[PDB]
Design a protein around this ligand. Sequence first.
Ligand SMILES: */C=C/C(=O)N1CCC[C@@H](n2nc(-c3ccc(OCc4nccn4C)c(Cl)c3)c3c(N)ncnc32)C1
Ligand SMILES: [Cl-]
Ligand SMILES: [Cl-]
Length: 277
Amino acid sequence: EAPNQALLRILKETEFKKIKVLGSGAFGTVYKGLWIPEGEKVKIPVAIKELREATSPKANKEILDEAYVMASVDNPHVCRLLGICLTSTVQLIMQLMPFGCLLDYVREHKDNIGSQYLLNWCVQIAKGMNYLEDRRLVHRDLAARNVLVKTPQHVKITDFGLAKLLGVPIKWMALESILHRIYTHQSDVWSYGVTVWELMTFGSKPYDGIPASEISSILEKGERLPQPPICTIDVYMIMVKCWMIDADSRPKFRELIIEFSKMARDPQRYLVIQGDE
Ligand SMILES: */C=C/C(=O)N1CCC[C@@H](n2nc(-c3ccc(OCc4nccn4C)c(Cl)c3)c3c(N)ncnc32)C1
Ligand SMILES: [Cl-]
Ligand SMILES: [Cl-]
């Protein structure tokens, strides 16, 4: 309820440039580039995401609401918007993270990642998600690919709210989302569980070898992702709770922060990793 004095920067096309493509995703294409604020004598390296065309009817109405949220973010574990340009296309400008997404990071560094880092990442993601819940925003696409590494000890969530805006990731979705297209903070919790599984397996693909078309059927039969080799039952049990059919029986993000935080105080008790003494 304090005044929100975030800045919404509406950028002229001349105030930034795209220099090199970094990759593409469900929502658009990401480039490294420069932000060159008019009359300020500086140039700042940034990431720029050019959004794909919306399949949604009202998205042009909603783009600004989405910008407001991204601009407004004030949590260490959620990424923020630097500026937005709306012309022929919508382009989002934000800080450039040299260390990239968490999914690639765990795959690339698997031999070197220990229990403290893994648990801390769980806490941090939970913290960011809790913040988004406080703001009444449902992410709809939480996944390891949508977490960026600021430093190996500091990760931040991206891309919240774009799925709705733009109008699927079946393997990360709660059953109610798949069957009924219902999305809630509790559906986010299910995705959080899948995301944790991705981390704990050093970036394995969930349900690898099962076609997306079969996922709703297997879930209904009680199948769930398996216990990762490094995980004690204490960690895995939390992940399984995230995947309860009854959304209200799943943990709250605030509870998740607490549970992971406790385990992060003695990480070797809760994850068993070679060379992690
Ligand atoms: C595993 C992730 C992956 O493969 N990629 C492809 C290469 C580029 C990577 N990447 N993406 C961004 C980025 C994410 C989200 C962005 O805007 C949406 C948003 N979420 C919160 C706030 N905002 C504005 C933007 Cl503009 C870029 C990257 C960034 N920002 N830095 C480094 N790599 C990024 C993902
Ligand atoms: Cl920060
Ligand atoms: Cl950020």
